[PDB]
């Protein structure tokens, strides 16, 4: 019960996590004509990556214990399908950021190797 209220705690804060990490990639707009903001919003966007890599971790972590707790064949049918919602949305909140991650670092430093 301390497990499905540890895990449960931890998916609240990672979800959250996530949601603002899209907020802040969705603000991050365009990238520069000017090579010289390029570089910074290339540089800011290693960090950012730095960032997604550590809550990787944690989004994997709250995977092991969500499926642990199915697993173990100790939950009500409810909670047992609320269990599976949540990785479900766990597993496509963070896939769709991990893309447009990877894209931008990409198109940030496709943009660079050539004006730079």
Same mark, same amino acid.
């Given at each position: 019960?301390?497990?499905?209220?540890?895990?449960?705690?931890?998916? +609240? +804060?990672?979800?959250? *996590?996530? %949601? &603002?990490? +899209?907020?802040?990639?969705?603000?991050?707009?365009?990238?520069?004509?000017? #090579?010289?903001? #390029? @570089?910074?919003?290339? !540089?800011?966007?290693?960090?950012?990556?730095? /960032?997604?890599?550590? !809550?990787?971790?944690? $989004?994997?972590?709250?995977?092991?214990?969500?499926? @642990?707790?199915?697993?173990?064949? @100790?939950?009500? +049918? /409810?909670?047992?399908?609320?269990? =599976?919602? =949540?990785?479900?949305?766990?597993?496509?909140? *963070?896939?769709? %950021?991990?893309?447009? &991650?990877?894209? @931008?670092? &990409?198109?940030? !430093?496709? $943009?660079?190797?050539?004006?730079?």
């Amino acid at each position: 019960e301390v497990n499905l209220d540890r895990y449960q705690t931890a998916l +609240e +804060e990672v979800l959250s *996590w996530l %949601l &603002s990490a +899209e907020d802040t990639l969705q603000a991050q707009g365009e990238i520069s004509n000017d #090579v010289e903001v #390029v @570089k910074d919003q290339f !540089h800011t966007h290693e960090g950012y990556m730095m /960032d997604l890599t550590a !809550h990787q971790g944690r $989004v994997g972590n709250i995977l092991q214990l969500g499926s @642990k707790l199915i697993g173990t064949g @100790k939950l009500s +049918e /409810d909670e047992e399908t609320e269990v =599976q919602e =949540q990785m479900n949305l766990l597993n496509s909140r *963070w896939e769709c %950021l991990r893309v447009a &991650s990877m894209e @931008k670092q &990409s198109n940030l !430093h496709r $943009v660079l190797m050539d004006l730079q």
